[PDB]
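**Tokenised fold:**
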Amino acid sequence: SNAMKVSGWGEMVKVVATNKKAYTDYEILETYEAGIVLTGTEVKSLRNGSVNFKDSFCRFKNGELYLLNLHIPPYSHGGVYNHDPERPRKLLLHKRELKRLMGKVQEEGVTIVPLKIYFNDRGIAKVEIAVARGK
């Protein structure tokens, strides 16, 4: 299901996936909010609250950060338009954030893990990611 929350400023978020294993197994050092480009069928499937982060991870490729092996199930009515459930998905961050994360992800024992997927007060999909170390 979908976890709804209105902030003290009247802004609504809809959390559709939470990486509970990352919260239990890692020390969260720093968090960032990334945008993400999703297809229409992916948005429909995310709104059904059935996505989890099992097997997913973040990796840089050519200076861009990707969320890899997140499984978003097919949309029931997508047919030939259904997305690739595990396509690589680029995370959209500020250049200054990307530069810092490229350094942090090279330190030993430090990795970049996805934490949450949610739709913000404009209806835009976001991924919260973290610089994290194993407990």
User: Anything to note?
Assistant: Residues 13 and 123 are 8 Å apart (CA to CA). The chain has one domain: 3-134. The domain at 3-134 is CATH 2.40.280.10 (Small Protein B; Chain: A;).
